[PDB]
Amino acid sequence: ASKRALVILAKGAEEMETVIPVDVMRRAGIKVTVAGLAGKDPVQCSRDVVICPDASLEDAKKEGPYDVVVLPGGNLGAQNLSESAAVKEILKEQENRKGLIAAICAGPTALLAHEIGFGSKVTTHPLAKDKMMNGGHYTYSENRVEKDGLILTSRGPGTSFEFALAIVEALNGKEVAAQVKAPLVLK
Amino acid sequence: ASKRALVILAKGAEEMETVIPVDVMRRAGIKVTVAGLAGKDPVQCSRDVVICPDASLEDAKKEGPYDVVVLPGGNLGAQNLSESAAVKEILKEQENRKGLIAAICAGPTALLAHEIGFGSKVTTHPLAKDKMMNGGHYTYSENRVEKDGLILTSRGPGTSFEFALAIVEALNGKEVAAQVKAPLVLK
Ligand SMILES: *[C@@]1(=O)C(=O)N([C][C])C2=[C][C]=[C][C]=C21
Ligand SMILES: *[C@@]1(=O)C(=O)N([C][C])C2=[C][C]=[C][C]=C21
Ligand SMILES: [Cl-]
Ligand SMILES: [Cl-]
């Protein structure tokens, strides 16, 4: 059966961190739902790229659960995710069922906000480290991608391919990840 | 004065190759117009990400000329660009005024279709080489980014940051490109 991914898209999301994982996961045969935090309408990302979500988060939640929940970064996107009761519920449920949670750049600060994955080894964008580490609830890593069990984190736009391929490997295996990687012309 | 970029967005464009240069150029302070080939409506990219253009190409052309014209790849996106009389006119004008033209993945095959830049050293996605080289009108390169004068080409999603930063360097200089690069967490 095909794996399913929920990508939560908030105003101020980093568009590269949104699009690269969506595209790469779709290349891997994953059924991806781009879910609008605020509803069904187009989302203005951090650098003003406007993406039309596949569905509202409210609607996508009804089709859960998902094999991965993905949180893009962008400061303002991550803040919107961090402030959302709907996101809290989704992540709690995902953690409780031992489903994968993936977050990049400032995205992992939403895990802190929602008390998800405490004790995990995590990375973030360098500028988000102090926020993530407030209280010492995680252990910090400078690895480009950090996977500690079902908490998968990464650092920035420039680690987005690695992040996406790590998700692919987690869901569909090493060989599919390698197959998807080769046509991308990665270094 | 701020530099200006026209990114031409066609149905079936590779969304990563569209979004990474738009975002990176905006980080560099470039005024970027995402112009819809087919008009003002949202564009369904190759892996089903839907992007709302800033304007129709018809409207953006009236605000030209631009310091760079950017052609994303994606096979079907590149075919749409290759078949467009409007694109032909834009590229011819740009070449005639000695303005930069940038194309990635299958994107450079539109340069062939529109007889732009013949004699240049170019790269493409490996799968687009034979198409690009039909007639031997260019010299082929396996460099991740190839800049031959005002024709700047690149290979794939995985070279999109390098491609975007090369555009930035061409328009705004090495130091701005380095400044924009550092927060991205590139390898
Ligand atoms: C990234 O997308 C993000 O969330 N942040 C805030 C820390 C950031 C900063 C600089 C580049 C990329 C990102
Ligand atoms: C790229 O975006 C593109 O245009 N092509 C067609 C050659 C391609 C193929 C495989 C990965 C990326 C791209
Ligand atoms: Cl940001
Ligand atoms: Cl394609």
Side-chain angles (χ1 to χ4, degrees), chain A residues 14-16 19-20 22-24 26-27 42 47-52 125-126 144 155-159 161-162 183-187, chain B residues 14-16 19-20 22-24 26-27 42 47-52 125-126 144 155-159 161-162 183-187:
Chain A
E14 224 298 329
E15 42 269 78
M16 297 184 285
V19 171
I20 289 159
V22 169
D23 184 324
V24 171
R26 286 184 176 150
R27 291 167 176 267
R47 267 74 186 176
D48 286 343
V49 171
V50 179
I51 299 175
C52 299
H125 195 275
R144 295 174 60 80
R155 311 203 82 183
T159 65
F161 285 99
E162 292 153 87
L184 298 177
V185 203
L186 288 161
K187 213 175 295 171
Chain B
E14 224 298 329
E15 42 269 78
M16 297 184 285
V19 171
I20 289 159
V22 169
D23 184 324
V24 171
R26 286 184 176 150
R27 291 167 176 267
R47 267 74 186 176
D48 286 343
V49 171
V50 179
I51 299 175
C52 299
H125 195 275
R144 295 174 60 80
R155 311 203 82 183
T159 65
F161 285 99
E162 292 153 87
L184 298 177
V185 203
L186 288 161
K187 213 175 295 171

Short mmCIF file of all heavy atoms in Angstrom, two decimals, chain A residues 14-16 19-20 22-24 26-27 42 47-52 125-126 144 155-159 161-162 183-187, chain B residues 14-16 19-20 22-24 26-27 42 47-52 125-126 144 155-159 161-162 183-187:
data_model
loop_
_atom_site.label_atom_id
_atom_site.label_comp_id
_atom_site.label_asym_id
_atom_site.label_seq_id
_atom_site.Cartn_x
_atom_site.Cartn_y
_atom_site.Cartn_z
N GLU A 14 8.48 28.58 4.71
CA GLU A 14 9.55 28.69 3.71
C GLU A 14 9.15 27.82 2.52
O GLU A 14 8.98 26.59 2.62
CB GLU A 14 10.92 28.27 4.30
CG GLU A 14 12.05 29.21 3.91
CD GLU A 14 12.31 29.27 2.42
OE1 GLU A 14 12.09 28.23 1.76
OE2 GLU A 14 12.74 30.36 1.95
N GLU A 15 8.96 28.48 1.38
CA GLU A 15 8.43 27.79 0.20
C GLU A 15 9.35 26.69 -0.32
O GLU A 15 8.87 25.69 -0.85
CB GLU A 15 8.06 28.80 -0.94
CG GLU A 15 9.06 29.90 -1.17
CD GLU A 15 8.75 31.14 -0.35
OE1 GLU A 15 9.06 31.14 0.87
OE2 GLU A 15 8.24 32.12 -0.94
N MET A 16 10.67 26.88 -0.23
CA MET A 16 11.59 25.84 -0.69
C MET A 16 11.47 24.59 0.19
O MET A 16 11.48 23.48 -0.29
CB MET A 16 13.04 26.35 -0.68
CG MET A 16 13.28 27.50 -1.64
SD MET A 16 15.01 28.03 -1.71
CE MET A 16 15.19 28.92 -0.17
N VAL A 19 8.06 22.94 -0.86
CA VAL A 19 8.00 22.34 -2.20
C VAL A 19 8.98 21.17 -2.41
O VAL A 19 8.64 20.18 -3.04
CB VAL A 19 8.17 23.45 -3.29
CG1 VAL A 19 8.34 22.88 -4.68
CG2 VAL A 19 6.99 24.42 -3.24
N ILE A 20 10.20 21.26 -1.87
CA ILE A 20 11.18 20.21 -2.13
C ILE A 20 10.68 18.89 -1.50
O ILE A 20 10.66 17.87 -2.18
CB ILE A 20 12.61 20.63 -1.67
CG1 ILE A 20 13.20 21.70 -2.58
CG2 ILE A 20 13.58 19.45 -1.62
CD1 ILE A 20 14.32 22.48 -1.94
N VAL A 22 7.56 18.00 -0.74
CA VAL A 22 6.34 17.57 -1.45
C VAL A 22 6.71 16.88 -2.77
O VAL A 22 6.27 15.77 -3.06
CB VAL A 22 5.39 18.76 -1.70
CG1 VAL A 22 4.28 18.37 -2.66
CG2 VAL A 22 4.79 19.27 -0.40
N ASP A 23 7.54 17.53 -3.56
CA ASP A 23 7.94 17.03 -4.86
C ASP A 23 8.70 15.69 -4.72
O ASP A 23 8.36 14.68 -5.32
CB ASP A 23 8.72 18.16 -5.55
CG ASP A 23 9.16 17.85 -6.98
OD1 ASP A 23 9.51 16.70 -7.30
OD2 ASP A 23 9.25 18.86 -7.74
N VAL A 24 9.74 15.69 -3.89
CA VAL A 24 10.54 14.50 -3.70
C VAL A 24 9.70 13.30 -3.18
O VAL A 24 9.89 12.18 -3.64
CB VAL A 24 11.77 14.80 -2.79
CG1 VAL A 24 12.50 13.51 -2.40
CG2 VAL A 24 12.73 15.74 -3.51
N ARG A 26 6.47 12.83 -3.65
CA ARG A 26 5.65 12.41 -4.81
C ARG A 26 6.44 11.62 -5.83
O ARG A 26 5.97 10.60 -6.35
CB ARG A 26 4.93 13.60 -5.41
CG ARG A 26 3.75 14.08 -4.56
CD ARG A 26 2.95 15.20 -5.18
NE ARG A 26 1.79 15.53 -4.33
CZ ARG A 26 1.22 16.71 -4.20
NH1 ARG A 26 1.64 17.79 -4.86
NH2 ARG A 26 0.21 16.84 -3.36
N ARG A 27 7.70 11.99 -6.06
CA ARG A 27 8.61 11.17 -6.86
C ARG A 27 8.79 9.76 -6.33
O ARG A 27 9.03 8.82 -7.09
CB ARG A 27 9.95 11.86 -7.04
CG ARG A 27 9.91 13.11 -7.94
CD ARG A 27 11.21 13.88 -7.80
NE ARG A 27 11.23 15.01 -8.72
CZ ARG A 27 11.73 14.99 -9.95
NH1 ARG A 27 12.38 13.93 -10.39
NH2 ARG A 27 11.60 16.05 -10.73
N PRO A 42 -5.26 30.06 -1.00
CA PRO A 42 -3.84 30.07 -1.31
C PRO A 42 -3.04 30.63 -0.14
O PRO A 42 -3.52 31.50 0.59
CB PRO A 42 -3.74 31.02 -2.50
CG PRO A 42 -5.06 30.85 -3.18
CD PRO A 42 -6.03 30.78 -2.04
N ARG A 47 8.79 34.14 1.09
CA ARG A 47 9.38 34.93 0.01
C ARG A 47 8.33 35.16 -1.08
O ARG A 47 8.65 35.33 -2.25
CB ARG A 47 10.66 34.27 -0.53
CG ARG A 47 11.91 34.78 0.15
CD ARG A 47 11.97 34.18 1.54
NE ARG A 47 13.04 34.70 2.36
CZ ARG A 47 13.22 34.37 3.64
NH1 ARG A 47 12.39 33.52 4.22
NH2 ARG A 47 14.22 34.87 4.32
N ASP A 48 7.07 35.19 -0.66
CA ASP A 48 5.96 35.63 -1.48
C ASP A 48 5.51 34.70 -2.60
O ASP A 48 4.58 35.04 -3.35
CB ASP A 48 6.21 37.06 -1.98
CG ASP A 48 6.04 38.10 -0.90
OD1 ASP A 48 5.44 37.83 0.16
OD2 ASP A 48 6.48 39.24 -1.14
N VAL A 49 6.07 33.50 -2.67
CA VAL A 49 5.51 32.48 -3.50
C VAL A 49 4.15 32.05 -2.92
O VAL A 49 4.01 31.83 -1.71
CB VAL A 49 6.44 31.27 -3.65
CG1 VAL A 49 5.73 30.13 -4.35
CG2 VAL A 49 7.74 31.70 -4.34
N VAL A 50 3.15 31.97 -3.79
CA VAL A 50 1.78 31.63 -3.38
C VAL A 50 1.42 30.21 -3.83
O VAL A 50 1.42 29.89 -5.03
CB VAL A 50 0.77 32.68 -3.88
CG1 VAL A 50 -0.66 32.31 -3.49
CG2 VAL A 50 1.16 34.04 -3.36
N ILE A 51 1.17 29.35 -2.86
CA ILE A 51 0.87 27.97 -3.12
C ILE A 51 -0.58 27.71 -2.74
O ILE A 51 -1.03 28.15 -1.67
CB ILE A 51 1.81 27.05 -2.30
CG1 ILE A 51 3.26 27.32 -2.74
CG2 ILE A 51 1.43 25.58 -2.40
CD1 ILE A 51 4.31 26.59 -1.94
N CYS A 52 -1.27 27.01 -3.64
CA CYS A 52 -2.65 26.57 -3.39
C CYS A 52 -2.64 25.19 -2.75
O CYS A 52 -2.23 24.20 -3.37
CB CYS A 52 -3.42 26.53 -4.70
SG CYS A 52 -3.49 28.14 -5.49
N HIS A 125 17.66 25.05 12.15
CA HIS A 125 18.48 26.12 11.63
C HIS A 125 19.35 26.68 12.78
O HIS A 125 18.85 26.82 13.91
CB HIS A 125 17.65 27.26 11.08
CG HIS A 125 18.45 28.18 10.23
ND1 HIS A 125 19.19 29.22 10.74
CD2 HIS A 125 18.74 28.15 8.91
CE1 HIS A 125 19.85 29.83 9.78
NE2 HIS A 125 19.60 29.18 8.65
N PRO A 126 20.60 27.05 12.48
CA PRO A 126 21.44 27.64 13.54
C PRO A 126 20.76 28.78 14.30
O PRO A 126 20.93 28.89 15.52
CB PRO A 126 22.65 28.13 12.76
CG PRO A 126 22.76 27.16 11.61
CD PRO A 126 21.36 26.79 11.24
N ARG A 144 23.24 17.61 9.45
CA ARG A 144 22.38 18.24 8.44
C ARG A 144 20.96 17.67 8.48
O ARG A 144 19.99 18.41 8.27
CB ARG A 144 23.00 18.11 7.06
CG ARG A 144 24.32 18.89 6.98
CD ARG A 144 25.07 18.69 5.69
NE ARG A 144 24.27 19.12 4.54
CZ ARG A 144 24.12 20.38 4.14
NH1 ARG A 144 24.70 21.39 4.77
NH2 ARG A 144 23.33 20.65 3.10
N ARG A 155 18.01 21.20 8.94
CA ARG A 155 18.52 22.55 9.25
C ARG A 155 18.03 23.72 8.41
O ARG A 155 17.85 24.79 8.92
CB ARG A 155 20.06 22.57 9.30
CG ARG A 155 20.67 21.47 10.16
CD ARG A 155 22.05 21.87 10.61
NE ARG A 155 21.91 22.73 11.76
CZ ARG A 155 22.89 23.33 12.42
NH1 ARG A 155 24.14 23.24 12.01
NH2 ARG A 155 22.59 24.03 13.51
N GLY A 156 17.83 23.53 7.11
CA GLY A 156 17.53 24.70 6.28
C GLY A 156 17.21 24.38 4.84
O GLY A 156 17.14 23.23 4.46
N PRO A 157 17.03 25.44 4.02
CA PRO A 157 16.71 25.21 2.61
C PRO A 157 17.71 24.29 1.96
O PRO A 157 17.33 23.37 1.21
CB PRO A 157 16.74 26.63 2.03
CG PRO A 157 16.22 27.47 3.17
CD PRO A 157 16.94 26.87 4.37
N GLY A 158 18.98 24.50 2.29
CA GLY A 158 20.06 23.76 1.70
C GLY A 158 20.20 22.33 2.17
O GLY A 158 21.03 21.59 1.62
N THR A 159 19.44 21.93 3.19
CA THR A 159 19.38 20.54 3.61
C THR A 159 18.03 19.90 3.23
O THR A 159 17.75 18.79 3.65
CB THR A 159 19.61 20.35 5.15
OG1 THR A 159 18.53 20.95 5.88
CG2 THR A 159 20.93 20.97 5.58
N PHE A 161 16.75 18.71 0.38
CA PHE A 161 16.79 17.44 -0.38
C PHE A 161 17.15 16.27 0.52
O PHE A 161 16.53 15.21 0.46
CB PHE A 161 17.75 17.51 -1.55
CG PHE A 161 17.21 18.31 -2.71
CD1 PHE A 161 17.60 19.62 -2.91
CD2 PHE A 161 16.31 17.72 -3.60
CE1 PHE A 161 17.08 20.35 -4.00
CE2 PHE A 161 15.82 18.43 -4.67
CZ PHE A 161 16.20 19.74 -4.86
N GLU A 162 18.16 16.46 1.37
CA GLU A 162 18.58 15.45 2.31
C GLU A 162 17.44 15.06 3.26
O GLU A 162 17.23 13.89 3.56
CB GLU A 162 19.80 15.95 3.11
CG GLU A 162 21.06 16.11 2.27
CD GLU A 162 21.99 17.18 2.84
OE1 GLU A 162 22.82 16.84 3.71
OE2 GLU A 162 21.90 18.36 2.43
N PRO A 183 18.05 10.83 -10.42
CA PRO A 183 17.73 11.83 -11.46
C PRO A 183 17.76 13.28 -11.01
O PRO A 183 17.63 14.17 -11.84
CB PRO A 183 16.30 11.45 -11.90
CG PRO A 183 16.12 10.04 -11.46
CD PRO A 183 16.90 9.93 -10.18
N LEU A 184 17.91 13.54 -9.72
CA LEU A 184 17.85 14.91 -9.23
C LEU A 184 19.14 15.71 -9.46
O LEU A 184 19.13 16.93 -9.36
CB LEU A 184 17.54 14.91 -7.74
CG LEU A 184 16.20 14.28 -7.42
CD1 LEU A 184 16.03 14.27 -5.91
CD2 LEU A 184 15.03 14.98 -8.10
N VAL A 185 20.23 15.03 -9.77
CA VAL A 185 21.53 15.68 -9.97
C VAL A 185 22.00 16.38 -8.68
O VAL A 185 22.45 17.54 -8.69
CB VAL A 185 21.58 16.63 -11.18
CG1 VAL A 185 23.01 16.81 -11.67
CG2 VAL A 185 20.73 16.11 -12.33
N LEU A 186 21.92 15.66 -7.58
CA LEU A 186 22.45 16.14 -6.31
C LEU A 186 23.96 15.93 -6.21
O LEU A 186 24.48 15.06 -6.87
CB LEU A 186 21.73 15.45 -5.16
CG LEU A 186 20.28 15.97 -5.03
CD1 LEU A 186 19.45 15.00 -4.24
CD2 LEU A 186 20.23 17.35 -4.37
N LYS A 187 24.65 16.75 -5.43
CA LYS A 187 26.11 16.59 -5.26
C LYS A 187 26.35 15.42 -4.31
O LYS A 187 27.28 14.65 -4.49
CB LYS A 187 26.74 17.88 -4.71
CG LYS A 187 28.16 18.15 -5.22
CD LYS A 187 28.69 19.50 -4.74
CE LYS A 187 27.90 20.68 -5.31
NZ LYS A 187 28.27 21.99 -4.69
N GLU B 14 8.88 22.30 -13.47
CA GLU B 14 9.38 21.64 -12.25
C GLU B 14 9.30 22.67 -11.12
O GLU B 14 9.95 23.73 -11.16
CB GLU B 14 10.80 21.09 -12.44
CG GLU B 14 10.99 19.69 -11.87
CD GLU B 14 10.78 19.61 -10.37
OE1 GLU B 14 11.07 20.62 -9.70
OE2 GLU B 14 10.31 18.53 -9.91
N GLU B 15 8.48 22.37 -10.13
CA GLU B 15 8.20 23.33 -9.07
C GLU B 15 9.43 23.68 -8.24
O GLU B 15 9.55 24.81 -7.76
CB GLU B 15 7.03 22.86 -8.15
CG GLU B 15 7.04 21.41 -7.78
CD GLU B 15 6.26 20.55 -8.75
OE1 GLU B 15 6.80 20.26 -9.85
OE2 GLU B 15 5.14 20.14 -8.39
N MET B 16 10.33 22.73 -8.01
CA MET B 16 11.54 23.02 -7.25
C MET B 16 12.44 24.01 -8.02
O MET B 16 13.00 24.92 -7.46
CB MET B 16 12.33 21.74 -6.94
CG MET B 16 11.57 20.77 -6.06
SD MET B 16 12.53 19.30 -5.60
CE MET B 16 12.51 18.35 -7.12
N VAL B 19 10.61 27.47 -7.71
CA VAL B 19 10.60 28.10 -6.38
C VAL B 19 12.00 28.44 -5.84
O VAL B 19 12.19 29.49 -5.23
CB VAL B 19 9.78 27.22 -5.39
CG1 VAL B 19 9.90 27.68 -3.96
CG2 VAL B 19 8.31 27.17 -5.82
N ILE B 20 13.00 27.59 -6.07
CA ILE B 20 14.31 27.83 -5.48
C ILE B 20 14.89 29.12 -6.10
O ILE B 20 15.33 30.00 -5.36
CB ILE B 20 15.25 26.60 -5.60
CG1 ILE B 20 14.81 25.47 -4.67
CG2 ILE B 20 16.70 26.93 -5.31
CD1 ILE B 20 15.33 24.12 -5.07
N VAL B 22 13.27 31.67 -7.53
CA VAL B 22 12.44 32.81 -7.11
C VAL B 22 12.82 33.24 -5.68
O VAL B 22 13.09 34.41 -5.42
CB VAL B 22 10.95 32.47 -7.21
CG1 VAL B 22 10.10 33.54 -6.53
CG2 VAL B 22 10.50 32.32 -8.66
N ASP B 23 12.84 32.29 -4.77
CA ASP B 23 13.13 32.56 -3.37
C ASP B 23 14.55 33.13 -3.20
O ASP B 23 14.76 34.19 -2.62
CB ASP B 23 12.86 31.25 -2.61
CG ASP B 23 13.02 31.35 -1.10
OD1 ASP B 23 13.90 32.07 -0.60
OD2 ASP B 23 12.28 30.56 -0.43
N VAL B 24 15.54 32.43 -3.75
CA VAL B 24 16.91 32.86 -3.63
C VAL B 24 17.14 34.27 -4.24
O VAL B 24 17.85 35.08 -3.65
CB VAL B 24 17.88 31.80 -4.22
CG1 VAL B 24 19.32 32.34 -4.31
CG2 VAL B 24 17.86 30.53 -3.37
N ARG B 26 14.88 36.65 -4.55
CA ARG B 26 14.22 37.59 -3.59
C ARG B 26 15.06 37.82 -2.34
O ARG B 26 15.19 38.96 -1.87
CB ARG B 26 12.81 37.14 -3.30
CG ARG B 26 11.84 37.40 -4.45
CD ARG B 26 10.41 37.06 -4.16
NE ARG B 26 9.55 37.44 -5.29
CZ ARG B 26 8.43 36.84 -5.66
NH1 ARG B 26 7.93 35.79 -5.01
NH2 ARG B 26 7.80 37.28 -6.74
N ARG B 27 15.71 36.77 -1.85
CA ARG B 27 16.70 36.94 -0.77
C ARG B 27 17.83 37.89 -1.12
O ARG B 27 18.39 38.55 -0.24
CB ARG B 27 17.24 35.60 -0.32
CG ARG B 27 16.23 34.72 0.42
CD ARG B 27 16.77 33.30 0.55
NE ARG B 27 15.87 32.48 1.34
CZ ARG B 27 15.96 32.29 2.65
NH1 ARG B 27 16.98 32.77 3.34
NH2 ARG B 27 15.01 31.61 3.28
N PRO B 42 -3.79 29.99 -11.52
CA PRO B 42 -2.80 29.14 -10.87
C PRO B 42 -2.25 28.11 -11.85
O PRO B 42 -2.95 27.66 -12.75
CB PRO B 42 -3.60 28.44 -9.78
CG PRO B 42 -4.66 29.43 -9.44
CD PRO B 42 -5.07 29.99 -10.78
N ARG B 47 4.83 18.04 -10.39
CA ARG B 47 4.52 17.14 -9.27
C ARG B 47 3.32 17.69 -8.50
O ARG B 47 3.16 17.47 -7.30
CB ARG B 47 5.75 16.93 -8.37
CG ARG B 47 6.55 15.71 -8.76
CD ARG B 47 7.30 16.03 -10.03
NE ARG B 47 8.00 14.89 -10.60
CZ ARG B 47 8.65 14.93 -11.76
NH1 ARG B 47 8.69 16.06 -12.45
NH2 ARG B 47 9.27 13.87 -12.21
N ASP B 48 2.46 18.40 -9.22
CA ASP B 48 1.14 18.81 -8.74
C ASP B 48 1.09 19.91 -7.70
O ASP B 48 0.00 20.28 -7.23
CB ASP B 48 0.34 17.58 -8.32
CG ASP B 48 -0.15 16.76 -9.50
OD1 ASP B 48 -0.18 17.25 -10.65
OD2 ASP B 48 -0.57 15.62 -9.26
N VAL B 49 2.24 20.52 -7.39
CA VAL B 49 2.22 21.74 -6.63
C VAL B 49 1.60 22.86 -7.50
O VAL B 49 1.94 23.01 -8.68
CB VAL B 49 3.63 22.14 -6.16
CG1 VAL B 49 3.61 23.53 -5.55
CG2 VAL B 49 4.16 21.07 -5.20
N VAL B 50 0.69 23.61 -6.90
CA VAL B 50 -0.03 24.67 -7.61
C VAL B 50 0.45 26.04 -7.14
O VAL B 50 0.34 26.41 -5.96
CB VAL B 50 -1.56 24.50 -7.46
CG1 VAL B 50 -2.31 25.63 -8.17
CG2 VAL B 50 -1.97 23.15 -8.00
N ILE B 51 1.03 26.79 -8.06
CA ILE B 51 1.57 28.09 -7.77
C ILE B 51 0.74 29.14 -8.47
O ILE B 51 0.39 28.98 -9.66
CB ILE B 51 3.05 28.17 -8.24
CG1 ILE B 51 3.87 27.11 -7.48
CG2 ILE B 51 3.63 29.57 -8.11
CD1 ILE B 51 5.30 26.98 -7.93
N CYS B 52 0.42 30.20 -7.72
CA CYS B 52 -0.29 31.36 -8.26
C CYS B 52 0.72 32.38 -8.76
O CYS B 52 1.48 32.97 -7.97
CB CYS B 52 -1.17 31.97 -7.19
SG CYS B 52 -2.41 30.82 -6.59
N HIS B 125 19.80 18.83 -18.05
CA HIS B 125 19.64 17.54 -17.43
C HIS B 125 20.24 16.47 -18.38
O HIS B 125 20.06 16.57 -19.61
CB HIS B 125 18.18 17.20 -17.21
CG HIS B 125 18.01 16.05 -16.27
ND1 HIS B 125 18.06 14.74 -16.68
CD2 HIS B 125 17.92 16.01 -14.92
CE1 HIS B 125 17.95 13.94 -15.63
NE2 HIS B 125 17.87 14.70 -14.55
N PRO B 126 20.88 15.44 -17.81
CA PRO B 126 21.41 14.37 -18.67
C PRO B 126 20.40 13.82 -19.68
O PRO B 126 20.76 13.52 -20.82
CB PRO B 126 21.83 13.31 -17.66
CG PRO B 126 22.22 14.11 -16.44
CD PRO B 126 21.30 15.29 -16.40
N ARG B 144 27.86 21.53 -13.41
CA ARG B 144 26.57 21.65 -12.70
C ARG B 144 25.86 22.96 -13.05
O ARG B 144 24.63 22.99 -13.16
CB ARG B 144 26.78 21.49 -11.21
CG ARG B 144 27.27 20.08 -10.87
CD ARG B 144 27.64 19.89 -9.42
NE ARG B 144 26.49 20.14 -8.55
CZ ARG B 144 25.50 19.28 -8.31
NH1 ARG B 144 25.49 18.07 -8.86
NH2 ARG B 144 24.49 19.64 -7.52
N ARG B 155 21.61 21.94 -14.54
CA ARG B 155 21.25 20.53 -14.83
C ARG B 155 19.96 19.98 -14.23
O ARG B 155 19.29 19.20 -14.87
CB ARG B 155 22.41 19.57 -14.49
CG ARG B 155 23.75 20.00 -15.07
CD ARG B 155 24.66 18.80 -15.19
NE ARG B 155 24.32 18.11 -16.41
CZ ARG B 155 24.85 16.98 -16.86
NH1 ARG B 155 25.75 16.32 -16.14
NH2 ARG B 155 24.47 16.52 -18.05
N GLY B 156 19.59 20.37 -13.02
CA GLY B 156 18.45 19.70 -12.39
C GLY B 156 18.05 20.27 -11.05
O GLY B 156 18.60 21.25 -10.61
N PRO B 157 17.06 19.62 -10.40
CA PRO B 157 16.61 20.12 -9.10
C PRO B 157 17.76 20.29 -8.14
O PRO B 157 17.85 21.31 -7.44
CB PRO B 157 15.62 19.03 -8.66
CG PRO B 157 15.01 18.59 -9.96
CD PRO B 157 16.21 18.52 -10.88
N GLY B 158 18.66 19.32 -8.17
CA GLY B 158 19.79 19.30 -7.26
C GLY B 158 20.88 20.30 -7.55
O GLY B 158 21.82 20.43 -6.76
N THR B 159 20.80 20.99 -8.69
CA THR B 159 21.72 22.08 -9.00
C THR B 159 20.99 23.44 -8.91
O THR B 159 21.56 24.45 -9.29
CB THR B 159 22.39 21.96 -10.40
OG1 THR B 159 21.38 22.08 -11.44
CG2 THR B 159 23.11 20.63 -10.55
N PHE B 161 20.04 25.41 -6.38
CA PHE B 161 20.65 26.45 -5.53
C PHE B 161 21.87 27.08 -6.20
O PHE B 161 22.03 28.29 -6.20
CB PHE B 161 21.04 25.92 -4.16
CG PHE B 161 19.86 25.71 -3.25
CD1 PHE B 161 19.31 24.46 -3.07
CD2 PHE B 161 19.32 26.80 -2.57
CE1 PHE B 161 18.20 24.29 -2.22
CE2 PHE B 161 18.25 26.63 -1.72
CZ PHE B 161 17.69 25.39 -1.55
N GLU B 162 22.72 26.23 -6.79
CA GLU B 162 23.89 26.70 -7.50
C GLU B 162 23.51 27.61 -8.67
O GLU B 162 24.14 28.64 -8.91
CB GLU B 162 24.70 25.48 -8.01
CG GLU B 162 25.34 24.67 -6.90
CD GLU B 162 25.53 23.21 -7.30
OE1 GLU B 162 26.58 22.90 -7.91
OE2 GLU B 162 24.64 22.37 -7.04
N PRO B 183 23.12 31.76 5.05
CA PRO B 183 22.02 31.26 5.88
C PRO B 183 21.26 30.06 5.33
O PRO B 183 20.42 29.50 6.02
CB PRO B 183 21.05 32.47 5.99
CG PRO B 183 21.89 33.65 5.63
CD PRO B 183 22.87 33.15 4.61
N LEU B 184 21.54 29.65 4.10
CA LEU B 184 20.79 28.57 3.49
C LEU B 184 21.21 27.17 3.97
O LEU B 184 20.48 26.21 3.77
CB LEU B 184 20.93 28.63 1.98
CG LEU B 184 20.38 29.92 1.39
CD1 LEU B 184 20.64 29.90 -0.11
CD2 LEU B 184 18.90 30.13 1.70
N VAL B 185 22.37 27.07 4.60
CA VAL B 185 22.90 25.78 5.06
C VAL B 185 23.15 24.83 3.88
O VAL B 185 22.78 23.65 3.89
CB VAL B 185 22.06 25.11 6.16
CG1 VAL B 185 22.91 24.14 6.97
CG2 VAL B 185 21.45 26.14 7.10
N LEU B 186 23.80 25.35 2.86
CA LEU B 186 24.23 24.54 1.72
C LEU B 186 25.52 23.78 2.02
O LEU B 186 26.28 24.21 2.86
CB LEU B 186 24.40 25.43 0.50
CG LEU B 186 23.02 25.88 -0.04
CD1 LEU B 186 23.18 27.09 -0.92
CD2 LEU B 186 22.30 24.77 -0.81
N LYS B 187 25.73 22.65 1.36
CA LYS B 187 26.97 21.86 1.58
C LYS B 187 28.09 22.56 0.83
O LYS B 187 29.22 22.61 1.30
CB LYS B 187 26.80 20.42 1.10
CG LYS B 187 27.57 19.39 1.92
CD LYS B 187 27.27 17.96 1.47
CE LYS B 187 25.81 17.55 1.73
NZ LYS B 187 25.45 16.25 1.11
#
